[PDB]
Amino acid sequence: FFGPQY
Amino acid sequence: FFGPQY
Amino acid sequence: FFGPQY
Amino acid sequence: FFGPQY
Amino acid sequence: FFGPQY
Amino acid sequence: FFGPQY
Amino acid sequence: FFGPQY
Amino acid sequence: FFGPQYQ
Amino acid sequence: FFGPQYQ
Amino acid sequence: FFGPQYQ
Amino acid sequence: FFGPQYQ
Amino acid sequence: FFGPQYQ
Amino acid sequence: FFGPQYQ
Amino acid sequence: FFGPQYQ
Amino acid sequence: FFGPQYQ
Amino acid sequence: FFGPQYQ
Amino acid sequence: FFGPQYQ
Amino acid sequence: FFGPQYQ
Amino acid sequence: FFGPQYQ
Amino acid sequence: FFGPQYQ
Amino acid sequence: FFGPQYQ
Amino acid sequence: FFGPQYQ
Amino acid sequence: FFGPQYQ
Amino acid sequence: FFGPQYQ
Amino acid sequence: FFGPQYQ
Amino acid sequence: FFGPQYQ
Amino acid sequence: FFGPQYQ
Amino acid sequence: FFGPQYQ
Amino acid sequence: FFGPQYQ
Amino acid sequence: FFGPQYQ
Amino acid sequence: FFGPQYQ
Amino acid sequence: FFGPQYQ
Amino acid sequence: FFGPQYQ
Amino acid sequence: FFGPQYQ
Amino acid sequence: FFGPQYQ
Amino acid sequence: FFGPQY
Amino acid sequence: FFGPQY
Amino acid sequence: FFGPQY
Amino acid sequence: FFGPQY
Amino acid sequence: FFGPQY
Amino acid sequence: FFGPQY
Amino acid sequence: FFGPQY
Amino acid sequence: FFGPQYQ
Amino acid sequence: FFGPQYQ
Amino acid sequence: FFGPQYQ
Amino acid sequence: FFGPQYQ
Amino acid sequence: FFGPQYQ
Amino acid sequence: FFGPQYQ
Amino acid sequence: FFGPQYQ
Amino acid sequence: FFGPQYQ
Amino acid sequence: FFGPQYQ
Amino acid sequence: FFGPQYQ
Amino acid sequence: FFGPQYQ
Amino acid sequence: FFGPQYQ
Amino acid sequence: FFGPQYQ
Amino acid sequence: FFGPQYQ
Amino acid sequence: FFGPQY
Amino acid sequence: FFGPQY
Amino acid sequence: FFGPQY
Amino acid sequence: FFGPQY
Amino acid sequence: FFGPQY
Amino acid sequence: FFGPQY
Amino acid sequence: FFGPQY
């Protein structure tokens, strides 16, 4: 799982 | 899963 | 799954 | 799945 | 699991 | 598990 | 488990 | 072969 | 082969 | 082969 | 595969 | 594959 | 083979 | 695979 | 093979 | 695999 | 094979 | 695998 | 094989 | 595996 | 495995 | 690929 | 790949 | 890969 | 890999 | 992509 | 990708 | 790897 | 990727 | 690896 | 990746 | 490794 | 990765 | 990685 | 890594 | 090789 | 080799 | 080798 | 080798 | 070698 | 060697 | 060697 | 693919 | 793939 | 699919 | 893959 | 993979 | 799939 | 993997 | 899959 | 892995 | 899968 | 692993 | 999987 | 898996 | 797994 | 790159 | 890179 | 890198 | 690296 | 590194 | 490192 | 390190 989440 | 999510 | 989602 | 969705 | 999360 | 978390 | 956590 | 471009 | 570009 | 680019 | 370019 | 260009 | 780039 | 470029 | 890059 | 570039 | 890079 | 670059 | 790099 | 680079 | 580099 | 169906 | 179905 | 189904 | 199913 | 169906 | 179905 | 299921 | 189904 | 299940 | 299902 | 389950 | 299921 | 399931 | 399950 | 043979 | 043989 | 044989 | 044989 | 044999 | 044999 | 034998 | 022949 | 032949 | 023949 | 032959 | 032959 | 033949 | 042969 | 033949 | 043979 | 043959 | 043979 | 043959 | 053969 | 053969 | 070069 | 070079 | 070089 | 070099 | 060198 | 060197 | 050297 990639992709940063605020 | 790519793509950042606010 | 690509493409960011606000 | 491409294409961003607001 | 990659991707930093605030 | 990678990715730093504040 | 890697990745520092504040 | 797949590549789009947005904005 | 997969690569998009955003903004 | 997978690579995107964002901003 | 040769991808997109910007400016 | 040669992708799109902008400016 | 997997590699993205962010910002 | 040769990926995208910016400036 | 896995490697991302952030900022 | 040859990944993306910035500037 | 696993290696990321942060900042 | 040859990864991304910055500047 | 595992190695990250931080900062 | 050859990883990312910065500057 | 050849890891990341900085400067 | 979407395969065959029966009844 | 999405395979066959029966009933 | 998504395999077959029965009933 | 997601395998087969029965009923 | 390969899938047959028999009977 | 390989999957058959028999009977 | 996610294996088969029954009922 | 390999998976059959029998009966 | 995530193995099979029954009921 | 290998998984069959029998009966 | 995560093994099989029953009921 | 190897896993079958019988009956 | 090896795991079967019987009955 | 080795683990079966019987009955 | 697919296809059953009696 | 797939396909059952009686 | 897959496929049962009587 | 998979596949049961009577 | 997998697969039971009577 | 896996697989029971009667 | 795994697998019980009657 | 069936390639060339000589004499 | 069936390759070339000589004499 | 790639095959040449020389002389 | 079936390779070349000589004489 | 089935390799080359000589005479 | 890659195979040449020389002389 | 089945390797080469000579005579 | 890679195999050449020389002389 | 099944290796080469000579005569 | 890699195998050459020389002379 | 099954190694090479001579004569 | 790696195996060459020389002479 | 590694095995060569010389002469 | 490592094994060569010389002469 | 194929093709010999003297 | 294939192809011999004198 | 394949291909012999004199 | 394959390929002999004189 | 394979390949003999005189 | 494989490959004999005279 | 394998490979004999004269």
Side-chain angles (χ1 to χ4, degrees), chain b:
Chain b
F1 166 85
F2 303 96
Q5 300 182 344
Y6 193 83
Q7 274 165 5

Side-chain angles (χ1 to χ4, degrees), chain y:
Chain y
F1 166 85
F2 303 96
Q5 300 182 344
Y6 193 83
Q7 274 165 5

Side-chain angles (χ1 to χ4, degrees), chain a:
Chain a
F1 303 82
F2 297 94
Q5 194 195 47
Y6 295 94
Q7 295 298 109

Side-chain angles (χ1 to χ4, degrees), chain B, chain C:
Chain B
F1 318 71
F2 325 86
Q5 46 198 50
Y6 334 85
Chain C
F1 318 71
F2 325 86
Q5 46 198 50
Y6 334 85

Side-chain angles (χ1 to χ4, degrees), chain Q:
Chain Q
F1 303 82
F2 297 94
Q5 194 195 47
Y6 295 94
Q7 295 298 109

Side-chain angles (χ1 to χ4, degrees), chain m residues 1-2 4-6, chain n residues 1-2 4-6:
Chain m
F1 318 71
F2 325 86
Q5 46 198 50
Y6 334 85
Chain n
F1 318 71
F2 325 86
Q5 46 198 50
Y6 334 85

